């Protein structure tokens, strides 16, 4: 490659659009196939102008829980306000000095 390091795949964020009515819980699945144990997973929100807001993070209204399968995580907003409409995504960041970040594709709430 150009890079002497092993390439890795970005996490996937599902479903590509989640529709839930007010007061309820909504839940995305961030599926990240790690290769190291040295990463963190972030849950972001894009405003209409593409500005980022970090909601939650694993390890630590907005919750992130790590499934026992080793692969998946669930991002869950509890009691969903409608000023919560819009755009949420996940990204993994490596912990090495030369940090690398891979972002998931984009979903709509």
């Amino acid at each position, epitope marked *: *490659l150009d*890079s*002497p*390091d*092993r390439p*890795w795949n970005p996490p996937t964020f599902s479903p590509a659009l989640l529709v839930v009515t007010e007061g309820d819980n909504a839940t995305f699945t961030c599926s990240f196939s790690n*290769t*190291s*144990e*040295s990463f963190v997973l972030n849950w972001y929100r894009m405003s209409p102008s593409n500005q980022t807001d970090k909601l939650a993070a694993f390890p630590e209204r907005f919750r992130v829980t790590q499934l026992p399968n080793g692969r998946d995580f669930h991002m869950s907003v509890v009691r969903a306000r409608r000023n919560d409409s819009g755009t949420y995504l996940c990204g993994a960041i*490596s*912990l*090495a*000095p*030369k*940090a*690398q970040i891979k972002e998931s594709l984009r979903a709509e709430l």
Partner: antibody
Amino acid sequence: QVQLVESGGGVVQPGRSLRLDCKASGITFSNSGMHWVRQAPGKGLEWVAVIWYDGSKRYYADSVKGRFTISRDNSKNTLFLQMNSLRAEDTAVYYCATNDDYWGQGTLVTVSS
Amino acid sequence: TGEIVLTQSPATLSLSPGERATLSCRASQSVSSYLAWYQQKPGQAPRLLIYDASNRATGIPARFSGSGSGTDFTLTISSLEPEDFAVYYCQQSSNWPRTFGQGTKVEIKR
């Protein structure tokens, strides 16, 4: 808790050979491209060699090409530098480092009679 | 294959704690943004500060910043801490062989 440890340093006579080891811990070694970098006493940093996480590619500095050979064993987490035809001006601290910048603490190689 | 020569200036920057430090690296040919900066203190391994011209390495304080592209690069320390007086090296990762600059010493002015 990530650690790079070089071993094999020491004294070696000119014209002879010496092999360095670098043992990695705390990382998945076979994901990381690996480098050797050297520093002669009172001088600047000098890149030595790189090996793909793969072993599929190796590159070398002009000053060591053909005399030194970099290799790795991804099943024992170790990186090697085989150094042949050593000369006085190869005297240096030798560091290993990952491509994502974890650094060992270095080992001194002295080429002398 | 060519050797990309990295020229750092000045050789020595003499400054007081709290002042702003500006270090330069010029490449003999374009390097795009594949330019890293390292700090080395005596008897210690180098340590990454800035990679790809302008990203801070993990845990590097905000007073360190990098900028530039092509052949002209700058490392800025906005306010020098006493820990910051040290030698700084630039390194290009655009081509093989990889090359370092010859280093700039940041010393206490007196």
